[PDB]
Design a protein around this ligand. Structure first.
Ligand SMILES: Nc1ncnc2c1ncn2[C@@H]1O[C@H](COP(=O)(O)OP(=O)(O)OP(=O)(O)O)[C@@H](O)[C@H]1O
Ligand SMILES: Nc1ncnc2c1ncn2[C@@H]1O[C@H](COP(=O)(O)OP(=O)(O)OP(=O)(O)O)[C@@H](O)[C@H]1O
Ligand SMILES: Nc1ncnc2c1ncn2[C@@H]1O[C@H](COP(=O)(O)OP(=O)(O)OP(=O)(O)O)[C@@H](O)[C@H]1O
Ligand SMILES: Nc1ncnc2c1ncn2[C@@H]1O[C@H](COP(=O)(O)OP(=O)(O)OP(=O)(O)O)[C@@H](O)[C@H]1O
Ligand SMILES: Nc1ncnc2c1ncn2[C@@H]1O[C@H](COP(=O)(O)OP(=O)(O)O)[C@@H](O)[C@H]1O
Lengths: 578, 367, 379
């Protein structure tokens, strides 16, 4: 007792314990257990960081304050330091000697309570070249006789996995569940605790700041539990605003600072648009339309979803956007998404649904069940989302995956959460789910038989409905049906590819100019409505790169200069030179 | 009473210690009661309260505030889920029979299978029921359980395997919250082999995880939501007259769920589609939620009545239930609102009025 | 890393659980970030709150060395804890935070360095900086809820191109002193860009610097005839090629000749069907001339025609003439849908998982090769 436990009453007398607020029924039942005749040993079990240790030390704090029923008055709770207890037990019997001496001291006191934090650790305290003769059994007979009182604290998992193993020790304690408090209890706890943090960080918290901290930590941080994550938000806000007086920012911590802390912790695009975040969102449709020609309404839908997200009008809990892009090949379905990722400056999560042809490939997405060979790997999808919570999720050619795999995205779109094999949950509320497919293509490109050609516009939707279950479609933000590229779009695509080729050549230090009629001839040569834009890339490659490759590989353009490409009219041929 | 209740509701210790602990805690409680000198005998009510607090289960509460909570539960839910009253009625009656003590022997509070077209309040009624009771909500998306060997994920890996020390998720959750609402979403999309776990649970209210530990489901409401049988109900027959395909819905459900599984259910509540007035109420609900979102930004909003009617007429889709209304309201309101909140008039200001003209059926905006 | 360093400093000055956790992919610079915080403290490039603070890197080996005689490890650990508590101005840096969840005494196996430290961290008594990769974190560290709760998660993200360029600029003098070689700015930028484009198995601030160091080391092995030189873009290209398997600038050698006479060297082996040799040579030339695709295979060709016309022979001869391996797959063996699992592997939890995929592994082992799909109509 001299130097192995710390007097918690002494701490509360010197203010070393943060004050216990609320927890009325919990502490009342802890006292009730303490007042039993036999096995008066309460065990505080609960989630990690919900106030179990807080309750245990707040009992002694209340004793010092005297706001306790007049049966635990003058009782002194001591926190056991197992670490220092085991320090010098090098020789046989030292541990048992010191432990039993402390035990008989506690027996003689008849007023003290021994609080053992993380009591699940005492299932072994030294069997070094020996048997079960450690503290796990030394403490057993004293509890059953009701001579001493011990308070335990452990999480549900550690309890179930370690403490429940020894039924003899397990039955000597009274399990008490410390549940996570609700909103009002948490904000009141913060109200009672924040004087100390204001003192430590030399700041002031507004009431709205505290309420916002509570609500945001609730709806944005799903890693931890309320009474600790809220005060963590508070502490980090205090520290940040305390580091600001380098420019003499002696002021209160308003709501905006709380949102800064929450966004920097949860890695979310918060803190209201502002600065230029507004400029970037403003001309995003432009920066995309200059790289994706035609199919502008897809860019419109994407930008509207992103703005609604940043404007605070997003969904309560859903991905930023859940889009199904369907249309013929080579019309920019994946390109608009990749360019959106590059424009926003965030991560692109590309997944090739063609690799998920079989039903049993779901385990590749979410991980293998426990006990199996691939358990230690987790799942690819959820791991990627957890690593990059703010990103764009691209699922290429979802019609190629097994029709059953869609049921994962079902829950992902509906709730924005996905649980891997470890019970961990990925947060999809900050991702844009975009799925590309060629579903309605073959049905729209059909030939009517009869004297009257029919309207086949609805056939793309018919095919998509036949492929995707009604509940899967019912969770999509919108289905943007892409149309084929028109000839002016083809000219613009040819120009974009010319710019790409020019960049490639500038890398080699040579310049290229292509006459306008040459561009027109290339467009008229390569245009194929049924195949979109890839034939343009192919024809441009064949017509320009191959002659250019020969010219620069074999001397004529080695460290060359200007490439002179123009079109003649008699043969529709191109010119070349240095 | 101490003996009987410690037997029936404590299953972690052995009888000669269970009863002694019940009696000792009752004595300590009656000894702490006389802070106002109420040194009394231990009545049956005190023993019942002690065991209910030990078993973490609800006691007799026909007088407390939760009696009123149960009194107005059906209405406090009907204000959030419009139509489909029979589901709310069944849920409330099951919760009452459990709380009234006139419950099932050792079964869960209620075992209900919710089936019907998508986009209706099958899962939403469950979320709002968990909120209205203030009890934990355990959500399990059975779509993550397509393979038959994912049962190991539910109940844990057998001893002598890599995933043993983690334990099952379902049993661990129920251990953490013995009084909760258990939501199993899209169970027909899980592997049909998984249904046998639910067989065992529904019949006995108990479940043994990998550690031989038994989870107690007697105080957990079991609600499972499916979209099974919907294809037939909405499938058009060929002929001059269409048939009620509800018989086909029943046939499909029986195809998917073995006879004993259907026998271990409290009821199968067939959710209906949403009517037009129900659509109007849904529009009102979503507009209220949008108004809350805007007030978070400091923007008041007023939407006219005929604008509401026009939104409902534009978004009404019988096949998809209430979900299309979300998109309709989204595009028709949030888009101009997002523009005005980002690079427009509604930056730190509100008073946005939306009204419908009759020449173009368009919306008004602005300060 | 001023943003991340500022986040770390903000975390350290907190009242409770003021223990930042540097989480990031390997090679990103987590250990580098901690030791550079120490370095800037030495140079005073810190806010006054962290000034005059001493960071200690905790060694686990020497801490557990010889800790027989139950209590030796505990006594030693508590002695370290007491020295740090008395210092009141020290931060303990644990390079591998996921490795302190076990400290022997498997009998019982509970009183380890993890449970020994939780009271200190929860009380805000001591400041410790951790570091771990993402998978180690999520599979080893975060499993201990109470320990993960006492640490503040900081994501150390992969830097950008220009950030990498500046990092290499700042690190260059040490590599110069080590190799006695000098780097040109164009060479550094080329190293960064080529490492991004062609090296796929590492992350920027550890693979661009890898190219820099290896170029310096090889140019240090050039003065066997005393070829004293600075590192130009050419050496960088050679280095990045030794991993990408195709040099871009070495084409100024006889590689130009091999390209030029390739069509003929094939025509002497494949008679007729000149169109195929022409197409293949044009594709390979466009690739080697830098005009090829930046994210596509060198060439994707479908050869169709009657039997015995040289469809398979021309590809084998092309592989021979180029000196590259022939990754040969017969699509008649993949006549069934489920056979794709041979090419890509089985999902986790299934019998063939640990084997991997045939095609992907063959490609990874041979980054530069010709892929032949015999009888594709049979798959
Ligand atoms: N009633 C309370 N009053 C004030 N703070 C509380 C209360 N309950 C919890 N806390 C906060 O939680 C922290 C203490 O956590 P607690 O001891 O409850 O969990 P724990 O013992 O750390 O759990 P584990 O052993 O799983 O880590 C304190 O920093 C405090 O801010
Ligand atoms: N609107 C467009 N503007 C510019 N380039 C385009 C456009 N549409 C297609 N492309 C070209 O096509 C390539 C990408 O095509 P994309 O991935 O969009 O096809 P897709 O719609 O996915 O068809 P599939 O799924 O069948 O491949 C780009 O390299 C780009 O040059
Ligand atoms: N009765 C209702 N009242 C109000 N809103 C409803 C109702 N039914 C559904 N909704 C809307 O639908 C959303 C919830 O959908 P839910 O999860 O119930 O779909 P579901 O029944 O699972 O369909 P599926 O299983 O086919 O996906 C809520 O956001 C809510 O706005
Ligand atoms: N901020 C930085 N400035 C310069 N170089 C850095 C920086 N961060 C990392 N590096 C480079 O990375 C190397 C050190 O690796 P670092 O400590 O960053 O990660 P690590 O210790 O390898 O991580 P782990 O411990 O997980 O393996 C150094 O050689 C250095 O060149
Ligand atoms: N055009 C050709 N020139 C020279 N040899 C050829 C030609 N076509 C076929 N052969 C010979 O016939 C054999 C079969 O050629 P291959 O291309 O593999 O046939 P397939 O097209 O059926 O795969 C080869 O070994 C090759 O030597």
């Amino acid at each position: 007792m001299e130097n192995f436990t710390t007097n918690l009453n002494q701490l509360a007398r010197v203010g070393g314990i943060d004050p216990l607020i609320g927890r009325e029924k919990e502490l009342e039942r802890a006292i009730q257990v303490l007042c039993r005749r036999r096995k008066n040993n309460p065990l505080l079990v609960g989630e990690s960081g919900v106030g179990k240790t807080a309750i245990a030390e707040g009992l002694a704090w209340r004793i010092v304050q005297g706001d306790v029923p007049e049966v635990m008055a003058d009782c002194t709770i001591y926190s056991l330091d197992i670490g220092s207890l085991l320090a010098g037990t090098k020789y046989r019997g030292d541990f048992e000697k010191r432990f039993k001496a402390l035990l008989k001291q506690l027996e003689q006191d008849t007023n003290s309570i021994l609080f053992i934090d993380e009591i699940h650790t005492i299932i072994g305290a030294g069997a070094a070249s020996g048997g079960q003769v450690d503290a796990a059994n030394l403490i057993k007979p004293l509890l059953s006789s009701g001579k001493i009182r011990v308070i335990g604290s452990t999480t549900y998992q550690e309890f179930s996995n370690i403490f429940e193993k020894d039924r003899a020790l397990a039955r000597r304690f009274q399990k008490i569940d410390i549940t996570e408090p609700s909103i009002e209890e948490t904000v009141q706890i913060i109200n009672g605790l924040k004087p100390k943090y204001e003192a430590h960080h030399d700041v002031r918290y507004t009431a709205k700041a505290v309420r916002a901290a509570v609500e945001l930590a609730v709806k944005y941080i799903n890693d931890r539990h309320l009474p600790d994550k809220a005060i963590d938000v508070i502490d980090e806000a205090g520290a940040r605003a305390r580091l600001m007086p380098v420019s003499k920012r002696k002021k209160t911590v308003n709501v905006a600072d709380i949102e800064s802390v929450v966004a920097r912790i949860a890695r979310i695009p918060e803190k209201s648009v502002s600065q230029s975040d507004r400029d970037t969102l403003k001309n995003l449709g432009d920066r995309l339309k200059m790289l994706v020609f035609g199919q502008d309404k897809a860019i419109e839908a994407l930008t509207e979803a992103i703005k609604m997200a940043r404007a605070g009008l997003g969904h309560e809990h859903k991905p930023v956007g859940s889009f199904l892009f369907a249309g013929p090949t080579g019309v920019g379905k994946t390109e608009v998404t990749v360019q959106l990722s590059k424009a926003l400056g965030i991560e692109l999560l590309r997944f090739d649904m063609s690799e998920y042809m079989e039903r049993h490939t779901v385990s590749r997405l979410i991980g293998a069940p426990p006990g199996y060979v691939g358990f230690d790997q987790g799942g690819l999808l959820t791991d990627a989302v957890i690593k990059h919570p703010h990103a764009v999720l691209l699922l290429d050619e979802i019609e190629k995956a097994h029709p059953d795999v869609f049921n994962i995205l079902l829950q992902v779109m509906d709730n924005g959460t996905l649980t891997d094999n470890n019970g961990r949950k990925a947060d999809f509320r900050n991702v844009v789910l975009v799925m590309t497919t060629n579903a309605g293509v073959r049905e729209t490109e059909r030939k009517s038989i009869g004297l009257i050609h029919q309207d086949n516009s609805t056939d793309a939707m018919e095919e998509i409905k036949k492929i995707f279950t009604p509940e899967f479609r019912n969770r999509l933000d919108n289905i943007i049906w892409f149309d084929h590229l028109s000839t002016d779009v083809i000219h613009q695509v040819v120009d974009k590819f010319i710019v790409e080729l020019q960049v490639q050549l500038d890398q080699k230090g040579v310049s290229l100019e292509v006459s306008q009629e040459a561009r027109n001839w290339l467009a008229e040569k390569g245009y194929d409505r049924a195949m979109g834009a890839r034939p343009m890339a192919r024809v441009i490659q064949d017509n320009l790169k191959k002659p250019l490759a020969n010219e620069l590989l074999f001397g004529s353009l080695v460290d060359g200069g200007q490439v002179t490409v123009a079109l003649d009219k008699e043969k529709n041929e191109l010119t070349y030179g240095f």
